[PDB]
Design a protein around this ligand. Sequence first.
Ligand SMILES: NC(=O)c1ccc[n+]([C@@H]2O[C@H](COP(=O)([O-])OP(=O)(O)OC[C@H]3O[C@@H](n4cnc5c(N)ncnc54)[C@H](OP(=O)(O)O)[C@@H]3O)[C@@H](O)[C@H]2O)c1
Ligand SMILES: CCOc1ccc(C=O)cc1-c1cc2nc(N)nc(N)c2cc1C
Length: 157
Amino acid sequence: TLSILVAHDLQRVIGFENQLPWHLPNDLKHVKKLSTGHTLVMGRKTFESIGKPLPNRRNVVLTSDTSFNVEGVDVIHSIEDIYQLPGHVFIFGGQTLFEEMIDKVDDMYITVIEGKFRGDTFFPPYTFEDWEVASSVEGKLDEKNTIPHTFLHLIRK
Ligand SMILES: NC(=O)c1ccc[n+]([C@@H]2O[C@H](COP(=O)([O-])OP(=O)(O)OC[C@H]3O[C@@H](n4cnc5c(N)ncnc54)[C@H](OP(=O)(O)O)[C@@H]3O)[C@@H](O)[C@H]2O)c1
Ligand SMILES: CCOc1ccc(C=O)cc1-c1cc2nc(N)nc(N)c2cc1C
């Protein structure tokens, strides 16, 4: 299976100055639950943003840099390389990867951040005419997690 994994706000903002615009521990827990034991494919900027590979899963970085050879990270240099990766592969960002992959993926695991943030990078537009809502689950709020959010699993019709 090839899936997108993304958090975007009400206006599809995903990032600002190479980081997330929001602090939301529960979204990171969601990512952990979905992708542990599986594969993440990410662009070079996203990787440099996190700074090290995420534990307990295969981290794959897409870059044109032929000098890229980082411990605990597998590198790929083409979109076409993604299709040779076994198991459940999650397209992990950022904007460029999402734009390149949204027409190719089986499904999407979206965390809708129910706020309006300043962004400089965006998830591409999509329509529910093309995507069935397999599930929609409201995130629980508390002291550590104060921004309303909804976990959507969308499957291409
Ligand atoms: N909210 C979220 O779900 C989420 C998730 C991840 C990231 N983000 C945010 O997204 C933003 C970053 O997005 P971005 O678009 O600027 O960068 P990005 O997608 O993370 O990385 C862009 C880089 O990926 C590489 N790349 C992409 N397609 C390629 C291809 N076909 N062949 C070779 N290399 C390719 C290139 O690296 P080289 O220049 O080295 O060739 C390119 O410059 C940040 O603000 C970050 O915080 C948000
Ligand atoms: C680009 C900055 O994003 C991060 C920085 C730190 C951490 C820490 O776990 C996680 C993220 C992060 C959260 C994310 N959350 C969701 N729902 N989906 C993603 N595709 C995603 C990707 C990254 C990279």
